[model samples]
Target chain A: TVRTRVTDLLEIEHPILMGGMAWAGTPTLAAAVSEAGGLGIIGSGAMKPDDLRKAISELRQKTDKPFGVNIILVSPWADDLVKVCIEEKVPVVTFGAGNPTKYIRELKENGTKVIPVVASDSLARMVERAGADAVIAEGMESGGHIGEVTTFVLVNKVSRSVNIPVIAAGGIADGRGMAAAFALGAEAVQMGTRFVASVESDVHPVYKEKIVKASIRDTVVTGHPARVLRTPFARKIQLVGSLRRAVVEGDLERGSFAVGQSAGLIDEIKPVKQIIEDILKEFKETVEKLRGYI
Target chain B: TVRTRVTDLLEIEHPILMGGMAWAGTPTLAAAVSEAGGLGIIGSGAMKPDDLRKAISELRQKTDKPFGVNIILVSPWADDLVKVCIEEKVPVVTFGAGNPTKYIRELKENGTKVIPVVASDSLARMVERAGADAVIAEGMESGGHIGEVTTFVLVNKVSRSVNIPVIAAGGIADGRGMAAAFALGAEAVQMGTRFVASVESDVHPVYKEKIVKASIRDTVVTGHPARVLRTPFARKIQLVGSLRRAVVEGDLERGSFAVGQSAGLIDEIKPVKQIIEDILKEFKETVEKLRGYI
Candidate 1:
């Protein structure tokens, strides 16, 4: 079976990719996953070009493996960040939120592989048509802003809808899901939530605890074009966001909680290497299990 | 507000309730959670009365504290299981599927606290009227079997609709959710998938790995009155009767891998104590963070 072309060229063990979750996905975390043999992505969500350049250099100092940087296309620093990424000659760079055509083409010209986040069949077609080397369908179960289709539905739709390799995103938190994505026709899986609990994540310890104890029942999608778990704040926001002064200013009781649909399945906080190894073990077992039926 | 009632009634520390997941929530597992502090519930799905008695007796030997038995009324074993529960003097009996009218009235008269899982406002009222001491307004995100409303939504709706102490189920996996459940009018929270990854759980190593690496987006819900993620087996269970052959038969490719919508939010393999402590920490921090905002 073909792993993602980018992953293969980059010589990663698994085609699985971790999303650069801005504050959640830090250089240390990214380097950790990369060191574990899967590709890592650091979220450069609004960081200045120079700052990002320094951060990337710091991360490079941490790991010798190839790591990617995520550029939120809608961020004010999109253009500048893109320049920094290009200048750094990052092996991988992903574009999310807005158009990635010019950036994709430019990145390709500069010897960087590009993956753009999509949420629908239409977006997959649009991205692939727009010269994106690959498309990652960021389904509705994802954290922060998300689309409507769940990961399973989105992965199948995008892979069937387009010839370009589809990297399943949004709901992929484990190896079974990864195998499930592959069965759904995705050549790669791009994940985010799992790494948030890794020791490398910059999130608060309590936040990581919430992630660890989450069950399959611990989430909800609220607000416009966003999916999240229903915490006190999120519920309050949905019930009466504007009416409550608590919500607008990040009141935990009335503010949104950072979570995706996959948060509930996790049960431990370990090093990123252990998490990656765990996924590989599951993947191997699954492949062995499928050997009988398929 | 009513934190100690359910746990006090069940004779456990905290009001944390173990979800009665069929097959998975075995006797040894149930007893361990009870011994550790959380209320342990044995899912008596389609079991013979004798078998139920045997399991209960076994659990009793391990833990002196009260543990409950769950009866899915729609199951073929419902009548016998109820009989066994009453006969065994099961202190707390939870009913999931079908109406718990006769069971509730009988158990209440017999001095057993009957808790009925309610999904809607009407259901909560009906259950309370039927003589249930409390109602677990299970939302759509619950693992195994579930309802349509989310934890906060259903808890809020049910709490507002009834006078009984509402035990919120679904989407509440940790302390933050527990705090949120209380905030949303529930006196306690019932968890399922989180317990599945606990040390006491009977999950296969592969199954545990799948849960540990799971993200907030990794879970989905399907099946009648049941919501689950897209496990390698979930999509293949064409009917309920076939679930045994698919899952119990160790056929991961063709089974009913029932998980709540919250499966996406979980990651890790942890002891129940750590899980609970982390949740409590998240709860504290979330409240503190919210206070900071205000």
Candidate 2:
């Protein structure tokens, strides 16, 4: 029953969106989420033009439903990737890390929806004026790069400051968080940590287990300010080094387990379908509970 | 209609509690909040035995409804102030800055409800074991001292980890914030910035104006990570010096306007009763809007 402008714009069954995580967000995972009626995103991390096209094609073959392609704005091939997205006629493109103003006009001309992940209201407003279809306001509790603002403070402010739909991200594990986001004026909720532990995620089982076992205190913002699950390796090295070892090498002791503070709430690895269903179910129950409060 | 264990324990009509801000949280403000059905707190900042005693008497005359007193655990006069609370038969006492274990037994034995402001689950669990009535889980988005956790991430974790009721604090400005706090599993909420702008708050009009004019970006965490209004003085001075000038000198240009990120949400200064009523009204509306989402 949960719906919003985001659901209509993205043509999804629910307002839930899977976060695009490097290495972990594969076509399989993206297709699973889209098949389950949520907006799925294929994170194009360091992929060349050919590889990116292949992945998008593979994703299309699995699920005809709409999905997004996420590209880091700071990546060397960001412009080329946008070109690839346009060439493949990708429905949506999400940008992170830097301004997407440079590509907004071109993306829009190609019939693509632009959704930027912004951490501040200034950025949110900037993207809205720059022709972004919508924005995901990611808070400090998010798994990767973070701002100092908390989700409770950031979401409502961003939603009010912009005319377009606002998607709340960070520290959300289930339906209560989604209900809280709606109360804060968010049109939708985007989850990274919750999706990281989903069945179709490409992360190592050890990495997912680390996320499942994390306490709220286990996640630490390291180096310049990226949240990662603390381990012996995460404590000693910078975030990039820790992530490389954990995701690619499966070294739990020496690798960085990148996850949000909400990881502590995730007890099991379920399929994408169950994750979306539970979120909607919890969303319904939380709203019912809220009705009693008033 | 909104009830929680905190409302029951504190004998208040609403689950909202005014934060004990030094210099600004005066007798008039505390009494006003109490008269309006929320738990008002008299912040005993640098007040000696005689001054503190006189303030308590003045507050009692203003309203007979239950109120609380706040004492910094690290203050030099903390022991004396705790003694004063016990002597005056104060109903509740909230502790901040340090552990309250040293004085918990004495406060409880005197029939006081001991509530400690904690920033972590470890501290919350510690206080609960030490016989605390409840703990306010204050996030880093708060004014003054802060912890690394966000309210959205910390409140539910502490609520689940502890046996007693949990009160959420930091970056909360209105009813939407209150509803979100409840969704996070907090039985109540403690707000600082919102109360700081109340008409009864004993702060300079210049200081209040600064809060009213602030945008989300105008509040920054500076100098060892205390959130404050980003005035010219705040940019140059350390946290303590800035706070002193703002509160005592009324120098808006050269003083620190210590407040939270939610300062941006405050547009006008209203009476305490009107403020509480507005929050409850908004809380009800937000809950109603949430019902439509599910």
Q: Ignoring the other chain, what TM-score does chain B have in each prediction?
A: 0.91, 0.95
What TM-score do all the candidates reach, one by one?
0.53, 0.94
lDDT of 1 by residue, B159-190 (tens): 76788788878666665466545544566778
Q: Write the per-residue lDDT of candidate 2 for residues B1-294, one digit (tens) a residue.
A: 588899999999999899877777678889988889998998886577677799899999999999989898778898999999999999999998879998899999989999999988889999999999999999877887777788888887888789899999987988889998888778899988888788888778888888888876687766746777777866675544556678666787777677887886788888888888888898999988887765
Scored by lDDT, the top model is 2
Model 1 chain B is weakest, by summed lDDT over 10 consecutive residues, at B285-294
User: What is candidate 2's lDDT per residue for A18-39, written digit by digit as tens?
Assistant: 9877777778888888888898
lDDT (Cα atoms) of all candidates against the true structure: 0.69, 0.85
After superposition, candidate 2 runs with Cα above 4 Å error:
A237-242, A252-254, B232-234, B237-242, B252-256
Give the number of the best model, judged by DockQ: 2
Q: What is the DockQ of each candidate?
A: 0.02, 0.66
